[PDB]
């Protein structure tokens, strides 16, 4: 089909000249003669019937003049119920060594976004079981959740815990898109779900599909794996009227990969160094990941915050695309509170007394206010001394510290790290416990009793153990 | 050899097209028709039988079409014993008006670095008589020594002190390479060495050769004079097999000259604006300045830090090429402590307890520790006051300040500035004095008594004098 | 976001032109350009891809003109011209309270006052989070 | 006598601390202005270099 020839191989950007009709942009080009499959996606019509293409795999071995065919369609991936329990690449190739993925329906990774009249206006609440999330920044069923955080702050652990708590319980299928992450973590997740039962290698009851492009992959591949995963999720939303859970790790890699190829594509660098087409491409991806009126897709996306700078363009743009945001602060993790959710930075759209209820809203706002007042008091402490503050100031500091400790919750996925058994706190118990702490009913209990506990019943019980060991 | 017509002249970059036989890269092309020799160094084979060259002198008066004749070899300089006592320029021409340098052998400016199997591993302590250096950052014999400092912090004063304390006693020869420094400094050093006898204008008893590429020179020349001094040092290291002391001034100027010509050489600017080949060219130059198994070269290179900023690419890259590093700080000079060596930044590779000695190592580490703790308490002091400190903390502050004062030492080359006679302190006295100060034996003495003194005995004498 | 960059660039002008109808016919109107920063980002994307020479933060030099030829259309016409009004409420998202950034500086210079909101006040119980000190009305 | 002396000393010490803080913030503001201008210049230079290389 209009067999082209490679005219230049610079980095991942390969230019092909088509003597016959030029392939339209975003179509997939297959390089002939390579032992494996190398797919070149058209990016620009440079001119003189030449297309600038970004390779989806390594460009080593390419020789000028090599024949390149045109598929005629954007990269098409095997999609359907048969992808569950299978690991697939960006170009939809089985990488689990379990044979070909035999799906009767193929879909292209590139597609238009859902229309405005297809947007749903409902806002439910998803009880993850995490005290910080459910109280301060409640997640919503179908909403777009964002796990903002730096490096080594808890994004991967938190997302795996969310998979364990929600996805396992959720009857609908789930999709995990490992965009630009460590390959070791991908294998860990694959093995963990095998033993957990979410992926069954024997039967056909698997409930989670895996799309992985790790950082070992070339920049081009790392910029489309998210599109492949969301295409699979879209199939599980439109073709099948089911609720889906799309878990993507480090969406930031989607933006970063574009920055690694924009210069070769021929674009003038934008601020800091990202590609000029940052917001547009990010929206094109994100708008597709929504809950239409046909079906719901509750998406949890981990977003790496470069150098813990939220003002960085990549995390900054993604804030507008997410209904519920949970920012993991390194300073809190240094304090030891795990999860390291920043109580005064995390926000959710359903945090509305009409939606979450008056009591829930009041308790959450009280917690946030007391923590703000504690932040204010710390500056005074640094100069005056703790033994100089007023009794009201000391009471506020004590209660705020107790609340901060009670925010910490041991995770089942973190049982290996912390050593404590994982706990899941119901929303009612979370609200009741934080309300009691705000009231002061547990002021007599030491702060240590509130650290790494589940419900306040565990909190008071721990205090008694310490007294018995005193 | 081959005649080429000048096609383009931009700054120090001369574009010459050769009709036949393109001169190989790094060859010396001589311009024909100029009053003084203007040698061009082939930098890039641009193509179309055209070679882009870097000029080693002014390009004023050059016309498009002027003939340039290849020499067939890289820029060569007179090398040998006759060079001792003589001043040379980048191209090797004598600039001391004493006559031509009649050396039996001539060596090329550019040469390959000593190979891995020729490197030496011996490390010995070169006592300099300076308290800060000898105690915290001992200088290694035959190792590359770097003096980091900003504008007007004491780099050239310190290097003059090293010349006075070491080069005079050194049994071998020495080479002082002046790269991008004020010419009056060179004239002073030349006459000072003549007076001292290091440069004898009567008989061949001179022990130091001078190569000068001062800031008046064009950028191309300043980027190669260091290589000239390195070559004349290399001859003594290898052929004569004699230990040499290569004192270079502001190696930074070598990098700065490269940045000025890199723009005209058609290269995409790197960070800040330096050349994209900063690390490679700096390594190529530095790697040649190394002690080999044939001979030893103790290299004292002064490195200017732009804007007193050590994260600048030029000073930052130089750190990897130095065994001993001395970082002078402006703030220390502001307080008055001279030399302005930063106690907690200067480092050395012979500061090993199995090399420098356990006692010396312990003393140095303890001094660094107490100064670090004082730095850690600086903020609390600056806001609250020393009153809001533990009496133990006050002891650390009081002792640390005495150490900082005692680090200062009158310098022989600074007698004409401060009015105080220089004090060359032996290493043992420095170690013992800092032991005594750390222990607390001289806590009663005022801190001022430790400022600008030699051995601790002078400190106690000054303390009594302060009656 | 899915809409192409030119559409985001033209949206504020289209809305202002729609508003001008009321102002030019003696009817009072209010327009709220939410995220005028995003319009500047779209204009930057268009300009840089069009190879228009860059500037500070890669924003094209005429971004001030882009915002000024939009906010100045807001006016209170006199009685002879109908007496209509087109109130404008642009929204600019500062990053960590950087009111000295390119687009914030431009919009602040153009506008007749600002209503600064601080996240500290929002979590301190002060909702709305209007900082009375910084907020000013010419 | 002690209480009056203590209060007077505390007032003086707090005043001195405020003065020291004022000097420090003046120096830090100068540094901040320099660094901000440098950052803007550096990003400008990076963008220009990227444009010219194209």
């Amino acid at each position: 089909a209009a067999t082209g020839r490679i005219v230049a191989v610079i980095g991942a950007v390969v230019d092909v000249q088509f003597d016959e009709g030029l392939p339209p942009i975003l179509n997939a080009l297959e390089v002939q003669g390579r032992e494996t499959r190398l797919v070149l996606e058209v990016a620009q019509h440079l001119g003189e019937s030449t297309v600038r293409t970004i390779a989806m795999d390594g460009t080593e071995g390419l020789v000028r003049g090599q024949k390149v065919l045109d598929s005629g369609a954007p990269i098409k991936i095997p999609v359907g119920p048969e992808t569950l329990g299978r690991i697939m690449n960006v170009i939809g190739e089985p990488i689990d060594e379990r044979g070909p993925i035999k799906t009767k329906q193929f879909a292209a990774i590139h597609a238009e976004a859902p229309e405005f009249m297809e947007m749903s206006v409902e806002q439910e609440i998803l009880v993850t079981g995490i005290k910080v999330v459910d109280l301060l920044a409640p997640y919503a069923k179908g909403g777009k959740i964002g796990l903002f955080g730096g490096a080594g702050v808890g994004k991967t652990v938190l997302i795996m815990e969310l998979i364990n708590n929600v996805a396992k319980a959720h009857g609908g299928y789930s999709v995990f898109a490992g965009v630009g992450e460590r390959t070791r973590e991908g294998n860990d997740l694959y093995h963990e779900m095998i033993e957990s039962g979410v992926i069954n290698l024997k039967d056909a009851t698997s409930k989670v599909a895996l799309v992985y492009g790790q950082m070992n992959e070339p920049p081009g591949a790392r910029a489309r794996v998210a599109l492949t995963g969301l295409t699979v999720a879209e199939y599980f939303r439109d073709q099948e009227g089911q609720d889906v859970l799309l878990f993507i790790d480090n969406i930031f890699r989607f933006t970063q990969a574009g920055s690694e190829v924009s210069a070769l594509l021929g674009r003038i660098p934008s601020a800091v160094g990202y590609q000029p087409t940052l917001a547009t491409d990010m929206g094109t991806m994100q708008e597709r990941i929504t809950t239409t009126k046909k079906g719901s897709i509750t998406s949890v996306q981990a977003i790496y915050v470069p150098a813990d700078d939220l003002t960085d363009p990549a995390p900054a743009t993604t804030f507008a695309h997410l209904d519920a945001t949970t920012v993991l602060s390194r300073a809190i993790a240094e304090l030891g509170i795990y999860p390291a959710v920043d109580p005064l930075d995390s926000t959710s759209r359903i945090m509305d007394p009409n939606i979450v209820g008056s009591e829930h809203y009041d308790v959450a706002r009280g917690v946030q206010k007391i923590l703000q007042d504690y932040k204010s008091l710390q500056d005074i402490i640094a100069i005056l001394g703790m033994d100089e503050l007023s009794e009201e100031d000391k009471l506020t500091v004590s209660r705020a510290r107790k609340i901060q400790r009670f925010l910490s919750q041991p995770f089942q996925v973190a049982e290996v790290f912390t050593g404590h058994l994982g706990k899941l706190v119901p929303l009612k118990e979370t609200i009741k416990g934080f309300q009691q702490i705000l009231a002061g009913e547990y002021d007599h209990l030491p702060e240590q009793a509130f650290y790494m506990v589940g419900p306040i019943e565990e909190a008071v019980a721990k205090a008694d153990k310490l007294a018995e060991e005193h | 050899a081959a005649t080429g017509r000048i096609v383009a002249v931009i700054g120090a970059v001369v574009d010459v097209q050769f009709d036949e036989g393109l001169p190989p890269i790094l060859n010396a092309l001589e311009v024909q028709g100029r009053e003084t020799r203007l040698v061009l160094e082939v930098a890039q084979h641009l193509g179309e039988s055209t070679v882009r060259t870097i000029a080693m002198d002014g390009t004023e008066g050059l016309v498009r079409g002027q003939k340039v004749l290849d020499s067939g070899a890289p820029i060569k300089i007179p090398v040998g014993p006759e060079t001792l006592g003589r001043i040379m320029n980048v191209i090797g021409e004598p600039i001391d008006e004493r006559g031509p340098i009649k050396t039996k052998q001539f060596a090329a400016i550019h040469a390959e670095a000593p190979e891995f199997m020729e490197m030496s591993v011996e490390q010995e302590i070169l006592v300099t008589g300076i308290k800060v250096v000898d105690l915290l950052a001992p200088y290694a014999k035959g190792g590359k020594i770097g003096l980091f400092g900003g504008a007007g912090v004491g780099k050239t004063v310190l290097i003059m002190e090293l010349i006075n304390n070491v080069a005079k006693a050194h049994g071998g020869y020495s080479v002082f390479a002046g790269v991008g420094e004020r010419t009056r400094e060179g004239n002073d050093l030349y006459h000072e060495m003549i007076e001292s006898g290091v440069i004898n204008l009567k008989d061949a008893t001179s022990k130091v050769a001078l190569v000068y590429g001062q800031m008046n020179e064009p950028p191309g020349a300043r980027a190669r004079v260091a290589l000239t001094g390195l070559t004349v040092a290399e001859y003594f290291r290898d052929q004569e097999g004699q230990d040499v002391l290569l004192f270079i001034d502001n190696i930074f100027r070598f990098t700065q000259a490269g940045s000025e010509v890199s723009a005209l050489l058609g290269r995409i600017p790197s960070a800040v604006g330096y050349q994209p080949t900063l690390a490679t060219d700096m390594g190529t130059m530095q790697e040649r300045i190394t002690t080999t198994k044939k001979g030893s070269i103790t290299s004292v290179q002064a490195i200017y830090v732009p804007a007193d900023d050590l994260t600048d690419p030029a000073p930052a890259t130089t750190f990897a090429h130095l065994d001993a590093t001395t970082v002078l700080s402006r703030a220390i000079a502001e307080l008055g402590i001279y030399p302005a060596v930063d106690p907690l930044d200067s480092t050395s590779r012979i500061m090993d307890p199995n090399i420098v000695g356990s006692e010396h190592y312990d003393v140095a580490r303890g001094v660094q520790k107490i100064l670090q703790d004082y730095k850690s308490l600086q903020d609390i002091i600056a806001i609250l006051g020393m009153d809001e400190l533990s009496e133990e903390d006050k002891l650390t502050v009081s002792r640390a300040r005495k150490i900082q004062r005692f680090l200062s030492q009158p310098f022989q080359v600074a007698e004409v500035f401060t009015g105080h006679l220089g004090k060359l302190v032996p290493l043992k006295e420095t170690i013992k004095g800092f032991q005594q100060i750390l222990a607390g034996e001289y806590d009663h003495l005022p801190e001022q008594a430790f400022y600008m003194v030699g051995p601790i005995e002078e400190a106690v004498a000054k303390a009594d004098k302060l009656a | 976001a899915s809409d192409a960059a030119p559409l985001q660039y033209l949206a504020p002008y289209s809305g202002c032109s729609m508003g001008e109808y009321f102002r030019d016919n003696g009817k009072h109107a209010l327009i709220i350009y939410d995220d005028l920063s995003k319009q500047a980002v779209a204009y930057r994307q268009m300009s840089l891809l069009l190879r228009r020479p860059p500037g500070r933060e890669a924003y094209p030099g005429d971004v001030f003109y882009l915002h000024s030829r939009l906010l100045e259309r807001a006016a209170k016409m006199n009685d002879a011209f109908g007496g209509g009004s087109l109130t404008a409420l642009p929204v600019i998202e500062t990053q960590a309270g950087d009111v000295s950034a390119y687009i914030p500086t431009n919009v602040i210079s153009i506008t007749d006052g600002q209503i600064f909101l601080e996240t500290e006040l929002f979590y301190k119980g002060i909702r709305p989070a209007i900082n009375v000190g910084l907020s000013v009305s010419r | 006598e002690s209480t009056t002396s203590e209060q007077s000393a505390r007032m003086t010490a707090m005043d001195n601390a405020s003065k020291n803080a004022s000097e420090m913030i003046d120096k830090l503001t100068l540094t901040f202005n320099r660094t901000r201008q440098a950052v803007i210049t550096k990003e400008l230079i990076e963008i220009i270099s990227g444009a010219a290389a194209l």
Binding site: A331, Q372, K375, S376, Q378, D379, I381, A382, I383, G385, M386 | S376, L377, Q378, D379, I380, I383 | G97, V99, S100, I108, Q114, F116, E120, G133, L134 | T29, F32
Partner: peptide, 27 residues
């Protein structure tokens, strides 16, 4: 006053991570 001037916020002492922040933490 003028918005352009750098504005401090609650917790800055601890956020800095300097000696005063550490003193507050330990205290």
């Amino acid at each position: 006053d003028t918005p352009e001037g750098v504005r401090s916020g609650a917790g800055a002492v601890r956020d800095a991570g300097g000696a005063f922040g550490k003193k507050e933490q330990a205290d």
